[PDB]
Amino acid sequence: PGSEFMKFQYKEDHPFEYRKKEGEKIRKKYPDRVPVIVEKAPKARVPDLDKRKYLVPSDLTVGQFYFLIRKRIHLRPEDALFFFVNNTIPPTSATMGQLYEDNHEEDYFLYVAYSDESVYGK
């Protein structure tokens, strides 16, 4: 009850220095995009996406990114879905670039989890 640490398989599978090289290479090669890892939250009976690493246009809004991911995920129209970045639901009107700037980790990746619940891990 309360918060829970967001675990990402991408961080389990790749050492920090590997992730930081990739994050920096991406930011150098595609300055108008932000690298984003998208994985499921625990206890949610939802699909994995076909892939977890995304290069997102910086000016795409969070609302638009939600549209694309919700369409990509294999879910029924009645299924609820919420995004979490650093344990909080991001603003719909934010750009992915702003969200990235404020929330990316030391490896220069932004981490997004999704769940059918409105609190991460519940």
Author numbering: -4 to 117
What does the paper say about this structure?
We successfully obtained good crystals for a GABARAPL1–γ2-GIM complex, which diffracted to a resolution of 1.95 Å. In the complex, GABARAPL1 adopts a typical architecture for an Atg8 ortholog protein, consisting of 2 N-terminal α-helices and a ubiquitin-like core. The clearly defined region of the γ2-GIM in our complex structure contains 13 highly conserved residues (EEYGYECLDGKDC; 401–413). Generally, the γ2-GIM appears as an overturned hook lying in an elongated groove of GABARAPL1 formed by the α1-helix, α2-helix, β2-strand, and α3-helix. A detailed structural analysis of the inter-molecular interface between GABARAPL1 and γ2-GIM in our complex structure revealed a classic GIM-dependent binding mode. In particular, the aromatic side chain of γ2-GIM Y405 is deeply inserted into a hydrophobic pocket of GABARAPL1 formed by the hydrophobic side chains of I21, P30, L50, and F104 residues (together with the aliphatic side chain of K48). The hydrophobic side chain of γ2-GIM L408 occupies another hydrophobic pocket of GABARAPL1 that is positioned in the β2/α3 groove and formed by the Y49, V51, F60, and I64 residues of GABARAPL1. In addition, hydrogen bonds were observed between GABARAPL1 E17 and γ2-GIM Y405 and between GABARAPL1 K66 and γ2-GIM D412. Our structure also clearly indicated that the GABARAPL1–γ2-GIM complex is further stabilized by two charge–charge interactions: one is located at the N-terminal area of GIM–GABARAPL1 interface and is mediated by the negatively charged E402 of γ2-GIM and the positively charged K24 of GABARAPL1; the other is formed between the negatively charged γ2-GIM residue E406 and the positively charged R67 residue of GABARAPL1. In agreement with our structural observations, K24E, L50A, and R67E from GABARAPL1 all abolished any interaction with γ2-GIM.
